[PDB]
Paper text:
PimE, the focus of our studies, is a polyprenyl-monophospho-β-d-mannose (PPM)-dependent mannosyltransferase that catalyzes the transfer of the fifth mannose from a PPM donor to the Ac1PIM4 acceptor substrate, leading to the formation of Ac1PIM5 via an α(1 → 2) glycosidic bond. PimE, like many other structurally characterized GT-C enzymes, is an inverting glycosyltransferase, which is thought to operate through a single-step nucleophilic substitution mechanism facilitated by an enzymatic general base catalyst and can occur in either a metal-dependent or independent way.
The phosphate group of PP is located along the cationic half of the cavity. At the same time, the mannose head of Ac1PIM5 is positioned along the anionic half. Only the first three prenyl units of the polyprenyl chain of PP could be resolved, with the chain pointing towards the hydrophobic groove between TM helices 6 and 9. At the center of the binding pocket, D58, located at the tip of JM1, forms a hydrogen bond with the C2 hydroxyl group of the fifth mannose of Ac1PIM5. Y62 forms a hydrogen bond with D58, potentially stabilizing its orientation within the active site. The phosphate group of PP is coordinated by three conserved residues, H322, W319, and K195. K195 forms a salt bridge with the phosphate, while H322 forms a hydrogen bond with one of the phosphate oxygens.
Numbering used by the authors: 21 to 403
């Protein structure tokens, strides 16, 4: 029914408005709705700046069970030192509004990348995907994942080498996970932009050493970005290969042979999927789908890159293939409902790795969905 599709498109602004009102009401009416454990970490990290206790910092106020640390790169603390100058509520409401606006802007950028501009459809997409498990997880925790997605797609949209390079470098300096997006630029043969993005990431490392130095150092040696310190590896929310393999195993294999084989097979699948795509949005979406699978820690709130992927599926060049619609609706039903969020209740505690067949196998849900999408893209491209 394309008529109903047009009717709902016309009802965009007054559906995104409803979604934003509902989200804002929930956050500031329910206890722990505006808890913002990761925004409070970002605010209390730099708040201790200049006192030699920034990475030894722990934040158990909001989750006594698990003390939230400041695992971000020191450049993130440099960037968040201004947040120390803003009252907590004036920053919480600002951050929620910023994440919402970043979601709308990234949807608009995805539409522009696909070759069409549609403010109403962008509002509808923002409202519908606002409640996808990754987006609601980011909003709940205050984690900056929509903002970095916006920065990365802004870099992709801008053909100018310096703009894209600087955006990618700064965004990757704030968090190391989005650095995998740079690989897309390697695939796009944008060698100069990739070089500049790497240079900016190194200059962000230098800034972090300068400002947050003498307290946060050796961030790559003796630490290796160890997944354990960031958080539990086996918890179902950790939807990377490592999380699901640990669930089905009962013990974190980590760099084990069996995890390495999975890493290699997903590497080949993602490379074939990218080889099966030709448009910027699809290429970046495949690259980030692979990044979410290879990173040692990829919580649900990291999987906000799926939203541009669904936009590509339902509007990109493959808006007619039977498989394209099938997998777009599959991703929508999976994320909107959220299997990992539902399964997280079954496990005794976030630190329990042993699982029976149901709670372990169902823990491979998002991994299996991503691998199925990658294999489908590879086979359809090869054919």
């Amino acid at each position: 029914g394309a008529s109903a599709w047009r009717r709902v498109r016309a009802w965009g602004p007054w559906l995104l408005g409803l979604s934003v009102a509902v989200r804002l009401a929930w956050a500031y009416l329910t206890p722990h709705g505006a808890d913002l454990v990761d925004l409070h970490v970002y605010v209390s990290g730099p708040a201790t700046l200049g006192h030699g206790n920034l990475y030894e910092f722990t934040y158990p106020d909001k989750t006594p069970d698990f003390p939230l640390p400041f695992t971000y790169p020191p450049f993130a603390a440099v960037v968040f030192w201004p947040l120390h100058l803003i009252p907590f509520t004036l920053l919480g409401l600002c951050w929620i509004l910023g994440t919402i606006a970043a979601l709308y802007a990234v949807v608009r950028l995805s539409q522009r990348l696909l070759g069409f501009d549609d403010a109403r459809a962008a509002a509808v997409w923002t409202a519908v995907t606002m409640w996808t498990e990754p987006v609601r997880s980011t909003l709940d925790y205050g984690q900056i994942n929509v903002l970095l997605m916006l920065l990365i797609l802004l870099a992709v949209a801008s053909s100018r080498w310096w703009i894209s390079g600087t955006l990618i470098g700064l965004a990757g300096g704030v968090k190391l996970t989005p650095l995998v997006s740079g690989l897309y630029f390697l695939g796009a043969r944008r060698w100069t932009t990739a070089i500049w993005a790497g240079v900016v990431f190194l200059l962000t490392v230098v800034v972090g050493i300068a400002v947050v130095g003498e307290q946060g150092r050796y961030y790559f040696t003796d630490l290796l970005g160890k997944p354990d310190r960031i958080g539990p590896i086996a918890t179902v929310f950790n939807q990377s290969w490592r999380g699901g393999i640990s669930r089905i195993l009962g013990h974190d294999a980590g760099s084990g042979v069996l995890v390495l084989f999975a890493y290699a097979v997903t590497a080949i699948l993602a490379f074939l999927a990218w080889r099966a795509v030709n448009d910027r949005l699809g290429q970046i979406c495949v690259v980030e789908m692979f990044g979410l699978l290879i990173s040692p820690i990829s919580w649900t709130h990291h999987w906000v890159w799926m939203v541009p992927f669904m936009v590509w599926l339902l509007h990109g060049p493959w808006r007619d293939k039977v498989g394209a619609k099938v997998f777009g609706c599959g991703w929508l039903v999976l994320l909107l409902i959220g299997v990992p969020w539902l399964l997280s209740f079954a496990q005794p505690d976030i630190w329990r790795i042993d699982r029976p067949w149901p709670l372990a196998w169902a823990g491979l849900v998002d991994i299996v969905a991503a691998i199925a999408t990658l294999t489908w893209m590879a086979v359809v491209g090869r054919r």
